[PDB]
Every structure is written in C-alpha cells, then in structure tokens.
Amino acid sequence: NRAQKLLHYLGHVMVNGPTTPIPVKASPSPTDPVVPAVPIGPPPAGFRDILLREGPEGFARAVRNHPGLLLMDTTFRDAHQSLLATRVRTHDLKKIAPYVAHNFSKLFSMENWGGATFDVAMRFLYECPWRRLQELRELIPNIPFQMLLRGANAVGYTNYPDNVVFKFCEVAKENGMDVFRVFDSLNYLPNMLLGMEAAGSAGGVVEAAISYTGDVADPSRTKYSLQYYMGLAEELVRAGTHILCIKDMAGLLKPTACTMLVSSLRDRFPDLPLHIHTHDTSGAGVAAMLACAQAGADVVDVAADSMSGMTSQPSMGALVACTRGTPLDTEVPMERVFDYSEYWEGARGLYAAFDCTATMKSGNSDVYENEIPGGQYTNLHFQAHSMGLGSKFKEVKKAYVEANQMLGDLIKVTPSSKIVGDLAQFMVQNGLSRAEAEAQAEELSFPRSVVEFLQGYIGVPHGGFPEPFRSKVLKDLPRVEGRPGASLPPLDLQALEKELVDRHGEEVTPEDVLSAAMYPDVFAHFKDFTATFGPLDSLNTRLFLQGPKIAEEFEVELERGKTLHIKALAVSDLNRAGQRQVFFELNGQLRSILVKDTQAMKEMHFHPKALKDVKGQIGAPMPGKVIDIKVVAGAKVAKGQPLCVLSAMKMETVVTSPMEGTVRKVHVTKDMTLEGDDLILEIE
Amino acid sequence: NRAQKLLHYLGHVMVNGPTTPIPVKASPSPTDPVVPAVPIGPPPAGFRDILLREGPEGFARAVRNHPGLLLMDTTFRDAHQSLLATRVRTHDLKKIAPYVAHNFSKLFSMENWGGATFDVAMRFLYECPWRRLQELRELIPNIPFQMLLRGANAVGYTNYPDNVVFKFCEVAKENGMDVFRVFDSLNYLPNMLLGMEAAGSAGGVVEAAISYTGDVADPSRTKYSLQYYMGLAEELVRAGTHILCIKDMAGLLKPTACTMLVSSLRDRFPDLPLHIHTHDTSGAGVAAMLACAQAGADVVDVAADSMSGMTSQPSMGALVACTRGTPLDTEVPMERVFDYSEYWEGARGLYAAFDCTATMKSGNSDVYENEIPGGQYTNLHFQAHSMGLGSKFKEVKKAYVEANQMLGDLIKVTPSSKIVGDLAQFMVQNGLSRAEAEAQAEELSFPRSVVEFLQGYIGVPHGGFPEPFRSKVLKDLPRVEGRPGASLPPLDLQALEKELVDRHGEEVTPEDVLSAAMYPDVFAHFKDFTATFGPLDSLNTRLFLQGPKIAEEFEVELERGKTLHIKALAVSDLNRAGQRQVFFELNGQLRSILVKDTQAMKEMHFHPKALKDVKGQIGAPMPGKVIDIKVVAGAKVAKGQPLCVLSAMKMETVVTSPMEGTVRKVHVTKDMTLEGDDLILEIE
Amino acid sequence: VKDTQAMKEMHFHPKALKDVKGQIGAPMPGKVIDIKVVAGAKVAKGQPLCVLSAMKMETVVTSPMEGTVRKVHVTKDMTLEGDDLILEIE
Numbered sequence A, B: 001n002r003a004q005k006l007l008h009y010l011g012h013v014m015v016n017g018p019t020t021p022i023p024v025k026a027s028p029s030p031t032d033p034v035v036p037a038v039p040i041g042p043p044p045a046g047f048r049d050i051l052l053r054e055g056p057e058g059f060a061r062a063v064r065n066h067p068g069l070l071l072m073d074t075t076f077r078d079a080h081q082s083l084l085a086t087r088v089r090t091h092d093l094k095k096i097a098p099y100v101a102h103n104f105s106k107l108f109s110m111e112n113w114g115g116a117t118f119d120v121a122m123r124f125l126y127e128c129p130w131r132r133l134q135e136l137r138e139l140i141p142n143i144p145f146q147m148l149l150r151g152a153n154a155v156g157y158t159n160y161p162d163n164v165v166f167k168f169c170e171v172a173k174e175n176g177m178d179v180f181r182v183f184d185s186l187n188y189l190p191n192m193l194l195g196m197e198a199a200g201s202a203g204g205v206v207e208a209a210i211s212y213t214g215d216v217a218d219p220s221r222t223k224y225s226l227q228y229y230m231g232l233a234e235e236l237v238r239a240g241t242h243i244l245c246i247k248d249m250a251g252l253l254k255p256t257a258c259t260m261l262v263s264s265l266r267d268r269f270p271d272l273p274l275h276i277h278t279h280d281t282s283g284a285g286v287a288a289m290l291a292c293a294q295a296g297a298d299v300v301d302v303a304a305d306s307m308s309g310m311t312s313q314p315s316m317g318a319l320v321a322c323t324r325g326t327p328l329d330t331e332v333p334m335e336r337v338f339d340y341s342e343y344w345e346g347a348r349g350l351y352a353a354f355d356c357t358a359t360m361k362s363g364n365s366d367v368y369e370n371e372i373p374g375g376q377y378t379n380l381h382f383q384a385h386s387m388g389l390g391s392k393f394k395e396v397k398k399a400y401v402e403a404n405q406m407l408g409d410l411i412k413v414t415p416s417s418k419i420v421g422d423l424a425q426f427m428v429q430n431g432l433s434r435a436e437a438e439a440q441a442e443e444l445s446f447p448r449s450v451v452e453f454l455q456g457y458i459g460v461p462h463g464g465f466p467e468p469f470r471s472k473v474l475k476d477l478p479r480v481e482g483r484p485g486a487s488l489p490p491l492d493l494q495a496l497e498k499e500l501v502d503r504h505g506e507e508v509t510p511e512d513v514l515s516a517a518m519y520p521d522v523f524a525h526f527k528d529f530t531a532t533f534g535p536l537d538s539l540n541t542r543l544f545l546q547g548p549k550i551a552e553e554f555e556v557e558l559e560r561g562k563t564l565h566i567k568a569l570a571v572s573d574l575n576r577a578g579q580r581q582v583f584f585e586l587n588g589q590l591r592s593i594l595v596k597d598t599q600a601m602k603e604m605h606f607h608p609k610a611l612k613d614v615k616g617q618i619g620a621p622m623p624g625k626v627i628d629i630k631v632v633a634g635a636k637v638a639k640g641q642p643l644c645v646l647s648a649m650k651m652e653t654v655v656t657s658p659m660e661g662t663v664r665k666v667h668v669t670k671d672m673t674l675e676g677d678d679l680i681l682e683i684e
Numbered sequence C: 001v002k003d004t005q006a007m008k009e010m011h012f013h014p015k016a017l018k019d020v021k022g023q024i025g026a027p028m029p030g031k032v033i034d035i036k037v038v039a040g041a042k043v044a045k046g047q048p049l050c051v052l053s054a055m056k057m058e059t060v061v062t063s064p065m066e067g068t069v070r071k072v073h074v075t076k077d078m079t080l081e082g083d084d085l086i087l088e089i090e
C-alpha cells in the first residue's frame, strides 16, 4: 500500500519538476534500448568456481599458469564514474545481467563496486548498495567481483579507525564479495599495510595498486624514479600479496614506459600475475596496452566499445581484433561484443540529460600538462555547474596545474585530486595568481580541507608538506603525525545502533548501522525521503527523471508479488491554495491527489492597516495621496486641530485630531497613495 | 437515470459554444436580481373571482361600471420582442409570481403568451409552452391572463384549417385560460369572424383588435379615413363582442387624433369598455395615451419601468405619477412598482449578450416613413446579422419603404410585415433599384412567402393590390380565390396521434399533437433534442447559456426534494479523435464524462496511393520532383520502357512500365514533387 | 518614447567593498550555518567567524584583523553568495 506515496512522488515530479539537480537541460531519448536474447541454460561456470574450490593463492596460480591474456570489463563502475556522473540505477543493469552471465564467462573478473557508489546511492540517487549488490551476485554466480577500496578510509575521505574498517570488510566478505583492491592516495606505507592486513583478515584474493604518475622514460625528472616504484613493489611483494596491480588514472603510459617497466618487474617476479588499469583519455591507451600485453601483462582493464574512448577505458573491439592473429588470442566472440556495445549505447541515449559530450567532444592531448584524473572530470564539471562556474570551466582546468604545484608534484589521486580541485576553485573564484596566494597564505581563508591535509589527517606526502605555505596556513593549528588511523581513537559500534533504532526504524541490522556511522546525516535524509515516498527504484529511468506523461499507460512493478499500472490523466490547475490536483487512473480505478507547488504566494504590499477597535488608532478616511501632514512624530496636538491633509480630484478630507495627546509615529511621511483605513499615525 | 444526460450537456457546453446562436458577443453579468419580499397569506381577490361568479358580459359590465382606470401589463409578452429576441426562460419568470399575485390585485390582466412565443419556445429555447403556462396558473389564482391570437392562422403564418383553429382555441380555453384577443394582419372580415366564432365556441371573454395606420387627422391621408374605421368598428360591433381594442404597432397616435377617435367611438357606443395597445417608439406615446385616456378610455397597456421606452410600452411610473391628482385615480402604491423595476433592471443584464442598445442607442424618429412594427425590429436585426447582412442593416430598412410601395399602403403586423422584410432582404441582397425591379419582375425568382401572399393564402386586402406585378410573379401559378380557410381542405389529426406514438411517442399529449400539427419539423427536432439531453429549465440562465465556470460548486434542482450540489474540476484534451474528458463533483462523488468535440474537422486530401494488390498499378519508387513524362495517358507502353524521371536531391530513378500494354491515365502534372509509392499511372 | 510600465529595483544583501579592509565578504556562495561571534564582541586575529556549506565545501571565515565586531551583516539562515559583506570591522 505504497502506491499512494509513489503517486505523490509522480505528481511532485509533474508539478515541482525533477528533484535531482540537472547540470544541463536535455530530454531523454523516447526509444528504449534493446536487450539481446539469452540462452535458457544456466550461465557457464567462469573462474568463480575456482575460488569456491581452490584457495585464493591456488586461484592466482591457476590464472598465472594460464596461457593468454585475461580481460576486465570495467564498464559498470569506472566508465559510469568517468564518462557520466555515475547516476545509473540498477534496473537497466539487471536488464542485461543475464546476458553477461550467459555470454561473458571467459572474463577474468568483474568490477561492480565503487568508491562513490555509497555517496551516489545516498545523496542524489536513492538506493541501497548492499541490496542491488545482492541481486547482481544472485544473477552472476560464476564471475568473481572486484571492489574498490582505499588504504585508511574505507569509502570516506579522512583516515578512519581500524576496527570499523575491519568490520566493514568482514561484512562485505560475508555478503559474498570476491576480489578486493586496496590502494592509497599518496601510497602511504602504514595505510597500505593496514589495508593489506584487513583484506587478509577478510580472507580472499588480495591485490594492491601502485599509483602511476609521470613518465619513467624521462631521465631528466626522477622525482619518482623507476627505482622508487621498484622498491615500492619490493615491499609490496614481501608483504605477501596475491597479485600486483597497476592503475593509470590519467592514461599517462607510453608503450615504451609500458614495456620497460613491465620487463623491470617481471624479470624478478616470474610467477607474479599482472593487473593493469588505465583511462583512455588521450586516445593512445591502446598502443600502451598492446605493448604491455606483449611485454608480459596478465590482466588489463578495458571498457565496452560504446562506453569506451573519451576518458574511459579503451574498447573491446580494438584489442579483440588486434590479437586475432596474434598468439595473445583473446578468444572471445565478436557478436557478444556488438550486442554489449549496442545495448550500452542505447542505455546511454536514455541518460542524455547530462552527458558531458556537449562540453568536451573528443579526448585531447591536454592531459600531459593538466593531469586531470579520468574518472572525476565530468563530476568536477558538474560540481562547477552546481557552483555556477561552468562558464569559466576552461579557466577552471587552467588553474589545476598551479593548484597542484602549490603543494608540489603530489600523487594526485581522488582525495588529493579533490583537494587540488578545491584549491583551483578557490583561487579562480578569487582570481589571484601564485604569488598572491603564497605571500598571503595566512591571509586567505582556505577551507577546512586545506588545513585538514596540511595537518596530516590523511597522511604525510612522500615529498613532504610545503613548509612555508603550511607554516603560514596552519600556524597555531595542531599537527598530528604518525598513522592517523593509529592516532584516531576507536569508536563504539553498539550504542549508535540503539540511538538510530530509537530515532527511526524498528529493526536491527549491521548494514545500516555501519552506513550511518560512516555517514549519519545523508543516511537520515535518505530514510526520511524513502519513508515519505515508500520504496523506490522499481521505476524506469525516464519515469524516475521526468515522470509519466499525459494519457500514457505504464505498468509499475511495485514488488515481485504484484505489478500494477498507472494512467496519468490530467494536470488539473493551480488552486488558490498552493496545492494542485492531479488525475490518475490505476488498473481499474480513478484517483486524484493534491500536490504542493513551490510558488506559495509572492508577498507584496501588505501595508499596515489601522484597527478601529482602538479608537486612538487613526485610519485614512479616503484613499489617495497625502499633500502634507501638519504634525511631526512626538508632537503634542489638541482636539479638533488639523494634523493631516488627504488629496483627491474633487474632495479634500482634512484629518481631525481624535483627542488630546502626542503622536507616536507618522507612518505616512509625504505623497504616497493611501487606501481607505490606512495607518497614517497613532495619537494618544 | 437522468443526471448523465444533463452532465453530458454541461460537458458539451464547456467544450463547444452555446447551442443557440449568439447575435452579439458578450457575457452575462455576475449579478443576481433582488427578489422583493412576499407575504405568507393567500393572494387577495382580483378579478378571477368576479368572472368566476359572473359571465363574461357580467364581468365586462362590472369593469365598465368601475370609476377610474385599469391597467394592462405586457412585460411578459410584448417587452420580450420589443427589447430582446424573446429569449427569456421560464426559470427566471417563476421568481416574482408570488410577489405580484400578492402585491398586485388592482391590476386588470397580464399578457404572457403571444404570437411569436411558441416558434421560439421549441426552436431556439427548448421548452414546452403548455408546461410553463400550467406552472403559472397555480402561482396566480388571482388575476386573469390574456391570449394574443390571430384570426385565420392560429399561431402559424398561413391560414390554418378552421377545425384546427377551433379545437386549438377549445383546448386553450380548457387549459384554464381566461381572456382572449382576436386579431388579423389585414381587415379581412371573415378572418375576424372565424376568430371570434372560435372564441365563442371556446366560451369566455372575447376581445377583437383593430390595427391603426397613417393619420386620421390628416385630410391628405385618405386611404384609411375615419369613416373607413367607423365602418370597420360598426361591422365588428354588429358581429357582437365583449370588449373592443385598438392596436398601434408602431406608436403613431398623436393626442388629437386618438382623442377625436375616442370621442367618435364612445359617442355611438357609450357602454363598451375601451382598450388601447401602443408601442412607445416615437417618444410621444405617453402624452397621447394619457390625453385620449382622459378623453374616454377605460383600459391601458403599460410595460415595466426598466422594460419601457425605446419601442416597448410606457412605464408604470409615469402613468402612476400623472394619474395622481386626477379623477381617474389609478391608486397604486409605487414602492412595489419601484422594487419590481429594480428586479427587472437586475434581470436585464443576464440576457445582455443580445440587445437593441448595441445597435439602436436611442429612440429614433422617422418611424412614420418606415412604419416598422415595434415587435419586429429586434428580430429583423438579428435575422439580418445571422444572414450576414447585419453590417448593412441601415440599407435594409432603407429598401423597406420601396417594398411598401411594391405592395402599396397596407396594414402589416405579423405576416405581411415579415413578408415586406424578406422582400427587402432580397432587394438589398441583389443590390438592385426599385424601378427596374418593378420592370424585370417576371423572370426574377422571389421568396416563397411573397408567392404565397400574391396567391392569396391570407385574404383580400381592403384596398386590393396591383395586378401586373402579380401576373409577372405568379404567372402560371394556381391562384387562391375566396376565403383560403373555407377553400382549405379540412384534415384529421387522429392519425397524427398514432404516427407520433409509434414513431417516438409513449407519453404524447393532445397539446403535443397540436404542436406537431403546427410546426411538425421543429416539434420533432425539439422532442429528439430534449430526449437526448433530458429536461431543461431546471438551472440558472447564465448556467444554461454560459455554463458553470471552472473550479466552482453550484446547486441544481430536479424537483421539490431532488436538489444537487455540483462542482467541476477541469477538462482533458483531444485524446485521439477530438474527444474530451471532464471531471465533475457530485455531493460527494467524482464523475468523469466524455464529450465529442466538433471543432476537429481535419480535411486533408492526398495524391492517390498505388495499391500493391493491383499489379497493374505503378507506384513512385522515390519521392522527389518530376522532371519529365515520356508516356501520355491512353498510350501503348513497352515492357521495361522508360516513362518518367525522378530526382529529388541526389538519386535519379527512371520509372519503366514493368508490363506490356497500354496505360489508362497518368496522375502527373509534370511539375509537382510527389512522394514515393504514389499512383502515378496504371497498367491494364 | 520613454515607457512607463518599466519598474526596476535593487534589493537583498549588498556587496563587500574591497578598499575597506575592515569589511569582510563571503569567500564562497553557500548557506549560513553558524556565526561564531555576536555583534559587539571582541574578535582575535585568525579567529573563526562563520561557517559556510553548500554541497561538500566546508569553509570557516577567519578574522582578517583583531578588533571588536560592530554589526552582523551576515544575519542568519539566509543564503549568501561570494563577495557579500558578512562582518564589518572599524
């Protein structure tokens, strides 16, 4: 019995408009993407059976001894985050999940879990990550899944207590999550050791990712030399990981740097599998990927053709065709590739409301001097749009270079990238250059994020903080060193459950408790809106965004037990009250409800009205202009004396003092239109 | 049920316009007239008791014996056509009847029904005359009413069968009717004889009327001399009646003329009650009326103050005030006159959409040169407007005099007035002069009514009529001689009862049968229209003609206990075939109705499409502009022989005859861009 | 011809003046959350003044100088955009 709340949502969409902020105006494609047919038989068993049967190390050995190359479709997380603002719901994903299970059993592993998946499922979109994860894992019983995880902060942006992160990892593994990736913003050794230890405590296949920046083929700059990365890999390997992984956030891999680094690591690690992640922002990613594959790569990240290019991962087809005659022999059907690409482009056509292709058309070479992370460009563009700064977005990216170089050649990863982007925003809205910021570091009101980083909440940069700027900014601000996760006191996991179940909700589960501990207020708002509108996510994307149209019929699956349909009838009209009626016809009955519009009165005039109950109160006898008032406020007047004169074209009503006393205040000064019984002055 | 029909009517009124045509575009005023207060006790004793306890002769003697003056109110019949097109409903009428029946006892009689009363009560207004008359007798069991009748034609414009008129009068008298008027357009003595014979057969008060035209005080005016009128009056009085009357359809009585006339009449008949009827158009009506009422008159017609002036009768107020310090001593409390006038003034704005004021601003002179009947001018202007010649309406009345000379100086009230009007309509429509119209009147077709008059379906005029024009028009037509009514073959109506019954009659009353006998076409039309939408005259007049406005609640009655509470929300839009859905509110229920819009015509024609079932037919392969044609219609064609060339922008395709034979026709003009798959030509 | 039906007006919070160093303007456009100092109270150098939060950006306004506050132009619970006078120092 939530159809009432759902229709209230629909009517609120009809009147007040779509609720989620929209960066650019657009209209959804009326057409519906076509899903290809799927075989009746259960999906063929992929590599998940090995994990279910063999240990994580046994699985790693089986992959390593396998001849050929292993593939990852990263469309579900990295493309959505990068190309879009990853505002995709799970309905369309489920529409294709059986096809993927039935056809893509040769894939290495699947990425479905994001870092900002919680933020999008809470703040703007309204979904529970655990739920649709559960349905997807049901639909995919035979491909292992990979989730994104950071070093100290599990999904947050500040370092976090060890115990809560361990419990969260335990919960995720208990749910059925398969493969874990753990990394750090600056590759901070205590944080990465903590993450590796947490993943080992969870139990499963564990990898660590090395943040690659710059070019290792340039001997002029050895800020992070091949020796540096090699030693880093040395402590990672001695840490006992399953597989090493490499992530190219900005797609800055030359095939030369590819081959020399891959050889440099494979020579001393002959049985170590390889995982490669890159963003095809510059359009030359495919060459580097092919060079790595020739050089001894094992697993790589690559996106569907329709969702490829631009800033996402490269395409299926390029690598598939390039290795047909090549002994690499990716050995995957092209028909499934075409079906996947066509379905994905059809689905993208629906999310045309905020495609960044209007802003940026094709990937440029402006990454080698800008180093914008591939995954956050559209999101930061939309952040600027919310800030209204989209007009100068061309200068916004111009500021990023110096925003980073304020703090030096840092490892610009998602937290650091966000901080640098915030710094660029601040100095571009203030419009001051490098010298103005550096000389006035104390003077400028930097956000709490600047002092947060300079304090050392995330960690310590390998190169170290900028001492003069940090001294100018922090000054009296405390500086906590060491591992902040070790520095941060542990926090309770129990009394918060009681507090939340007292405030709302009358059931106990650890999932919502840990979610609210990670993020209380957005959790509360999400619960508020869901309660006011019942279950969601059972609708179509077009229905979710723009709502039903006039005299069109559409079936709505309320839940699995029953499915009904609603017929939108008419918009009715604005009432004198802010409520508006809207007409709706469900399966066999007609109904209409009241919708509040955001146009409640315009509040003009409301001139003071003299009250006749108080005989001392004076009201204007006739409406018109005032030629003059013979009395100033706080002046004594006598009974029957002229004190004010009203004006019209034929009569001149001279005001008479109602009694003896002094005038408090003259509401009318001179020459304003008056009404009958208007407050002029009060006499006592 | 019944609600559905009226609800559909309301929806149709919302979607479409008012069914009745609108002469002048306006809206009813948002004001309800004030009903004056009424007592509770039974109505006082008027004159219905007197005629009840006496005979018509005894009652007439009692009236004559009264010292003073007795007044006739024509605000229920004549003021209608004088000021409006006689569009007043009955629902508004049944709101002062208790007041006047209580307040007005000295009043002589009231005229409600009239000649042009039923021809609208079913044709434009949709009501039953007998029904409304039945609903007033109980409201006023105090004061006699008065019927206006014509001699030969009972209600119609052509002489009706004598039995028909007799039985009609008998039924009318049986309806409880009290006073009757006998009249004829011409002075055709058999017409008045038949009318008075029918009135006496019915049994009751019989009054005949004499038309007035020209001047009696002008020696030059000789066609209708005093002695002519004296002979008419003496013949009628020898026929023997109850009360005499005089008609002034145009308001042409000077005081001296009517006072000398009254002196002549009262001299030789100093017992007979004397009655006058005039239409105040020249503006001097009140003066002559009062003068030659002080002379010898007994009864005076008079209209309400608000419904006075212009062309209607003079007012209550002037006559009451003047007859104050006089022996006549009207003796009527004028306060009730005041409230009556106030109610009528309030009621006038309801039908303000059509009125003579918009055209006829003030009372115009020169009526002597025009002699246009007062009760005809408004309808004439309306019919000219509906004709489309309302623009040149002044030129229409200009041509009216020439038509008068065409027919000579004759008395015209109902039939011949509109006959001259239609002849002038033809005159102005053809834009032709009088003299040559007289000349080439042989071949020129004339309206059917002119032919009827020239044949003599009405009777012989007093002065005859020109022969050569009648020979030029009638020519070879049979011509009626003698009395048309006697020459008319009497016909039975008993078969009409069964015809009505078995066609659509299951409750038809003899009144309805008589109505069908009068105007069968519009009778059946009104019957079917009422049967479609149910009974009318149960709602407000603005509610009837304008309909309820959106988003307001209103109440409607059905009977004493059946009264509803109705509200309307809004209207849907044209869904798929010009149909609307509208949403009403019952006392507590919500209703949805469908209305078929009439403003959707969407007439579009296309070049014939080649049908694939016919192999011989040839269709256009590509849309585009035709360059040249190689085969003419009805010419032999070879198999695969070029016949047409098409080229739109890029492609050029030459159409060839796919089969051997000869063509029948080509649908090509060589110079039109024709779409593909079109029936360009055919093959045998 | 000069039209008469054109009425143009200006209102809402004014803009902080750059030459007046005592005038303190809003650095970012956002919602007023809390005000650290009430009008008529001494303010130290580098002291929090107001908190602004719009989408994820948290900003605390520091005191440009050391001196008592005279008027709270920022008021409370009304959105203020960048470069709007929030506090004035004499």
Ligand SMILES: *C(=O)CCCC[C@@H]1SC[C@@H]2NC(=O)N[C@@H]21
Binding pocket: A115, A116, A119, A376, A379, A380, A413, A414, A415, A417, A418, C056
């Ligand atoms: C709140 O919407 C701001 C969205 C931008 C931050 C998100 S968080 C995780 C991603 N990593 C990054 O740098 N921006 C993205």
Ligand SMILES: *C(=O)CCCC[C@@H]1SC[C@@H]2NC(=O)N[C@@H]21
Binding pocket: B115, B116, B119, B120, B375, B376, B379, B413, B414, B415, B416, B417, B418, B419
């Ligand atoms: C059309 O609805 C009927 C009214 C117009 C004819 C009436 S009949 C009596 C009057 N005399 C005349 O010529 N027209 C008027």
